[PDB]
Amino acid sequence: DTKEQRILRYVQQNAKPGDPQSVLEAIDTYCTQKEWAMNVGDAKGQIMDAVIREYSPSLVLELGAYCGYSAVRMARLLQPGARLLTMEINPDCAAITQQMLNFAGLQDKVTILNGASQDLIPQLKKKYDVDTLDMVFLDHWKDRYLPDTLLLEKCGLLRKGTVLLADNVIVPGTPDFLAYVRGSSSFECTHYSSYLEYMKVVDGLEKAIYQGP
Template sequence: MVSPAIALAFLPLLLTLLIRYRFYFVLFYRAVLLRVWRDCRTGLSREERCFQYVLTNATPGDPESILDGFDSWCTKKEFISHIGPKKGKILDRLLSEHSPLTVLELGAHCGYSTVRIARALPLGARLFSVEMDQKNAAIAEKVIRLAGFDEALVELIVCPSDEVIPRLRADFDLEKLDFVFMDHWKKCYLPDLQMLEGSGLLGKGSMILADNVLFPGAPNFLRYIRRCGLYEWRVHRATLEYSKGIRDGMAELVYQGTK
């Protein structure tokens, strides 16, 4: 057993670590421990619990009400890694400035960002939203339709991104993507970006916005865009959605074409 004297010697270090990394401990509790406990207690997934809350508290056909429902759940109940309202305003502004007609979303999850994007698109635009998890995609489909968006505006594609991207031109008659939002597996950011480059779907001025590039982080993706010379780019500094004290950021890329 550890003697009391040794335990007391380590107490200041332990307190220092708890204070310094308190926001990460809170995130671990909300995102992992609380989730596992409620999964076992309810027999429902975190995403299913969130959808039930939104369905009960939001107004059908009102995208803002649905987004507010998600934000309320994720703030007060359980953590889900949606883009959230603060970083969402950056996405809103870029969509408003560029008015894209063809949009690709990689990582629909529960449909939060899909609804956020769809509500900002001009008349005649199309949003292709990709989600590989079938259970999450089923929830996203319900959320998108609950918000009032039909398949003419939003098409949900249930498939891994690396299988969808090579087929976009042939299967969906796409010539160019005006806007791409990445919020799926961070390890996929770089290979999917390079796949988009190779597909010919990025034209001069095409914009890519990638979330969570600082936390959990996408270092290979950031290293590539710094060195490749194909983009004008910047990182919007922010904090992690529905959290305090955890630094994060969104990478904004504008494709300039091959050099």
């Protein structure tokens, strides 16, 4: 089996069905004690929580589900009726994410889409009936943060006040994205310094609030 399968099994055997907090704690324990994995982690996850609670978004898009850690973390704080769409290119990870969400009891709040963000983003309006997004969490291939931001704008998916929250702006880093948003009058940016998941290595999140064209 793969590391992602091992994380899923660990959750199923060490968390309580229907209890998202227990799911997060199980993943963080496994990744601290057994095998590192690229989940956002508890340090950065607490910053994410604080953001989600501030904005109470009704429709969130996540680019890069992986095993569903951040999807569980965000979806557990959404208000009744609010929804998360998450895009994952790797089909094995998409399946693990769906099972993770099912275990956590969050499947009715989240839609996990298996595919490349650049192909799925242009379908969101017509196929998935999206008007505009309240929040976007960027956590996919670091090279894709900037092109996919520009694509979201082109497709009319951003509105005044849409919150972009980007993981890994230090490690591995996303230098073109970061330079772009920090230099653009269309975004108001804030940097949240933190640590790489499960490591004593500095990392951070960037929040970039869209201001319109």
